[PDB]
Structure formats: C-alpha cells, structure tokens
Design a protein around this ligand. Structure first.
Ligand SMILES: N[C@@H](CCSC(F)(F)F)C(=O)O
Ligand SMILES: [Zn+2]
Length: 546
C-alpha cells in the first residue's frame, strides 16, 4: 500500500471560489478517489492562502480584523468545495500555529545554511498611511499617452508598460497621498544556488513535457534571488530576530501544505506520520496539482526551499491548463465568470465533475466549458447511456421478480469484456488521462445498450411464458451498470451513492469480478434527470447580475 500526500494549490482568502478553481479541485479529487479505491493510504490536503497586503487592506476597508475576514472566507470556501464533494482529509490555513512554526524553522535552516542574503531596496512609500506600496496600489498618469487614473506598471489605454515610479503625479490608492521613494533592508532566498539541482530534476523525465520545456526557458533567462520579506504593516508571520519584518506570503504559502498536514497529524494524535512524509528519506509520494500560473514557483522556488531546509521534495507536479467558457476566458459582462456557489444553485456537482473529467488529460491544455455542449453531453452520456442501463431494467426486476436478480449471467462473455477493461481504465485514471478513461467507459456503455436493444426487453415482457428470459436480460443490464458505475465512482460521488443504494452494495474496484447473482435490489426514483438550455440561460443571467 502506497502512502500518498496530494494537494491542490491554496486558494487566496480574498476571493470566492470560481469554475477555474473547481477544475483543479475536481481533477485532484477524481485522482484521489481512484487511488483510495485501489487501497492506498491517501492524504488529500489543502488550505486557504490567508496572508498578505491585499488581505490586510481589504480587512481594514471592511472595518473588521483580518482574522475575522479570512475566517469567513475559509468557511465560504469549504462550503463550496464540500458542495462539489472534494474529499479533503484536511483543509487548514496558512495563518496557523503549525505554519508559523514551520515557516520559522525552514527560514532558520535556510539562514544557517547560508541561503539567505540581506539586501537594501528602494520602493514607493505612502508617508501618510506609513506603508510601502505594492505596484497595484499606486495610481497616476501614464508617462506615454498622459491618460489619467492608471494603476500599477501598465496603462489600460495605450497599453504601455513601465515602473510605477514613472507615473506622472503618483497617488497612493490607499490614502491618496503622494508616495515617495524609501529604502528598506530585505531578506532574499538564494535560489540561484540550486540551479544545477533543479536542472537535473527537469531532465529526469518526471515532470510533464510541456513543463520541462518551460523550465528550460527560465534557466535560459537565469534564476534570480527571491525577496522573502515584507515590512510592517503586514498581515502575516514576523521574522525572528528582525523587528518590523515579516515573511513574504510566497515564503509561507507552500509551507502551508506542510502546516495543513502537521495539523491533521496532530489532530489524529499521530506522532510519526509527519516525519514519515516529509523527511528526506521518505518512501511516501508527494504530489501537487497546480495551474499554469504557479509552475515557476512550484518547480523552482519550492523544491529549492525544501532542499535547503533538509526536507524531501515533490515526487511530481501535475499541471492543468486554464478554464474557458464558450471558448473564451470567463467574462463578467457575458455572465460566464461563474462562482462555484452560483453553479450549485442551477446544477448538481456531478454534472460539472463529469464534463471536466471527459475533457481532461495528462497535458497542460486549456479546458473549455461549452455550455451548449455541456447540456448535450450530460444528457447523452449520464442520462441516456449509463443511468439508462439501470432505469430501463430496474422496473421489470422490481415489479415482476420481487427485486431479485437472476441466478446466473445471461451473457458471461460480454460481462468478461467489461471486467477485462478494468486494467486500461484504471491505468487511464492513474496516468491522469481522464478523457481516455471516459471514452473507454462510454464505449462500454454503448455496447451495454446495444445488448439490451438486441434482447428487446420491451418485446419479451409482453410475450407469454418469457418471464425467465426477461429477468435474465434485465439482470444482465443491471450488472453491466454495476461495472460502469464502479469505473465512474471516482467521477460521480453522488450518483454513485444513489446507485449503491439501488444495488444494495458498496462498489469496490475488485468487486466487479463477482457479479450480483440471486441478489435483491431496491426500487429507486429518478437516479439522474435531464438538464436543458433554459437552466444554462438562467445560470448565465444570474452570473451577469452578480
Ligand atoms: N494562492 C495562490 C496559490 C498558492 S499555492 C502555494 F503553494 F503557493 F501555497 C493562488 O491562488 O495562485
Ligand atoms: Zn498610456
């Protein structure tokens, strides 16, 4: 039994979960549920990324403590993920005692190992508010076209880019006062020192081809030292021995993966698993599911930090692309910027889980949610191919045979074709070739429905003395359904629970080898209903209104 620790990127605490986040959490959950079905020890870990200036300032605007604000967002995030049945073993926070101790520990080891450098920098400073200003909190007039009210390092009118120090008549977005250049000592992590170690990992062949290719571009550009400190005022962890200095969010953020796991172990009263998973000699596997925008961070900075602090590194990084709706980036004006909570007001979790899974692969390509296609695919595959197998046969069994399935398989050869596919389908789930697994499963679903069509139960049912044949045909269809729902169990948790209640049995991967014979099933009300474009229209309109 393998020991596996799987994570999803930690969501920022200052924004609601949207369909973009869901692609990642659903992809990981499918993989995690499959690994659990194969008997491995799995720890699915996540948490909110709760530190930083943006958060501190938002809390101040709302007139509440950052602690209260992140606490509310944490609850909101978990409610949404729970609604999509993302099976985390623990969901913690980067703002925790566990993360504080681990951040201090790692920093101390990096400093002791000579990987921390002191450097003085110059940055825009708000003298009224009394704080250094990140680029996005500095506004002014574009140096090129002279357009007013531009933010950060770029102009939204002429498209020019520049240092905020070039803005004409600069103004603090926080207080409106004119910012000035101010010096401050910062602490940098010497990432360049790990260049050779990182280059070796890149060419090892573990990472996705597209990722390794990207990394070569970054090595070509040249690794730089990374600033891991921030001056007060700040919402985060104070740096030991450095009054007024805090750990920059990106230093403590990934350590949150560790903090969340330590929290889980501590709550379980488990005093050995943390070290067994994070020590350099660990035989456990560590996987991070992440999006394209944070690959540089997880593939270079993170492994380097772990190495420098004597901890094991990721076994692999699983990168997915962006989510688009109707072919384009989510658009608020078009109502395609959809929140996870909003989605659930209109559709169930299984529908989106299935759709995403049917399009996912082991590559980093973008995933498109075409709403028209969504309706067609769900109705065609879930309702008409898979659920149909149960709904078209269950009635006769319950009404004509007291809910009892036949004592033998009507077509053992066909059943073997279904069980024989477990190896390829499981390997598809394992390798993250989700689209391939779904295609294979639906191909079997087509074969199953062809079988039922060929036997014509609707004809046999009205013909005198054909009771035995009817029970045989319908029981065969239900057993094929049993196998299909087993392969789809990691994808559709809710439909699976309903299927298990109907079948009177928990679905296990190895269980398909023993078909249900002389077995009692229960009656069921709509296992899964059709959806329509009117619902999609409502979702879009509701999203526009938000
Ligand atoms: N909050 C970040 C992800 C943090 S993953 C970590 F490892 F950096 F914690 C984002 O949403 O992009
Ligand atoms: Zn301009």
């Amino acid at each position: 039994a393998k020991k596996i620790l799987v994570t999803c990127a930690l969501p920022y605490a200052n924004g609601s979960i949207h369909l973009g986040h869901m692609l990642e959490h659903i992809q990981a959950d499918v993989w995690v549920r499959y690994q659990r079905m194969r008997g491995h020890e799995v720890n699915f870990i996540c948490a909110d990324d709760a530190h930083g200036t943006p958060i501190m300032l938002k809390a101040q605007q709302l007139g509440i403590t950052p602690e209260q604000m992140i606490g509310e967002m944490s609850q909101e995030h978990q409610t949404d993920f729970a609604g999509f049945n993302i099976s985390y073993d623990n969901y913690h926070s980067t703002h925790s005692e566990e993360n504080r101790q681990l951040s201090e520990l790692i920093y101390s080891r990096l400093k002791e190992n000579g990987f921390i450098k002191n450097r003085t920098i110059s940055q825009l400073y708000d003298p009224e508010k009394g704080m250094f200003l990140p680029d996005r909190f500095v506004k002014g007039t574009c140096p090129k076209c002279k357009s007013p009210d531009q933010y950060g390092d770029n102009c939204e009118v002429c498209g020019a880019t520049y240092s905020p120090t070039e803005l004409i008549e600069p103004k603090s977005v926080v207080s409106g006062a004119t910012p000035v250049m101010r010096d401050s000592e910062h602490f940098f992590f010497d990432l360049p020192s790990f260049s050779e170690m990182l280059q070796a990992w890149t060419r090892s062949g573990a990472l996705q081809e597209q990722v390794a290719n990207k990394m070569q571009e970054w090595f070509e550009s040249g690794l730089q030292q990374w600033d891991i400190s921030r001056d007060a005022p700040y919402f985060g962890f104070e740096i030991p021995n450095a009054p007024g200095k805090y750990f920059y969010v990106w230093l403590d953020a990934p350590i949150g993966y560790m903090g969340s796991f330590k929290n889980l172990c501590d709550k379980r009263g488990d005093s050995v698993s943390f070290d067994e998973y994070w020590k350099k000699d660990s035989t456990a596997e560590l996987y991070h599911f992440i999006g394209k925008d944070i690959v540089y961070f997880h593939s270079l900075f993170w492994p380097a930090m772990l190495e420098g602090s004597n901890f094991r590194k990721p076994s692999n990084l699983f990168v997915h692309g962006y989510v688009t709706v109707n072919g384009a980036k989510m658009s608020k004006s078009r109502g395609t910027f959809i929140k996870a909570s909003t989605w659930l007001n209109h559709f169930d979790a299984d529908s989106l889980r299935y759709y995403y899974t049917a399009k996912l692969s082991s590559r980093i390509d973008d995933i498109d949610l075409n709403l028209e296609d969504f309706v067609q695919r769900v109705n065609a595959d879930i309702v008409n191919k898979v659920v149909n197998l149960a709904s078209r046969n269950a009635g006769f069994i319950n009404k004509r045979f007291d809910g009892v399935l036949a004592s033998e398989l009507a077509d053992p050869q066909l059943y073997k074709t279904f069980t024989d596919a477990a190896e390829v389908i499981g390997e598809a789930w394992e390798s993250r070739e989700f689209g391939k697994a779904v295609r294979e499963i639906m191909a079997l679903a087509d074969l199953a429905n062809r079988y039922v069509d060929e036997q014509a139960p609707w004809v046999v049912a009205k013909q005198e003395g054909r009771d035995a044949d009817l029970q045989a045909i319908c029981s065969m269809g239900i057993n094929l359904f049993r196998v299909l729902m087993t392969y789809l169990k990691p994808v559709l948790p809710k439909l699976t629970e309903r299927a298990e209640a109907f079948l009177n049995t928990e679905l296990t991967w190895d269980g398909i080898q023993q078909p249900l014979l002389g077995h009692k099933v229960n009656p069921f009300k709509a296992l899964y209903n059709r959806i329509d474009m009117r619902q999609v229209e409502a979702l879009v309109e509701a999203s526009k209104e938000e």
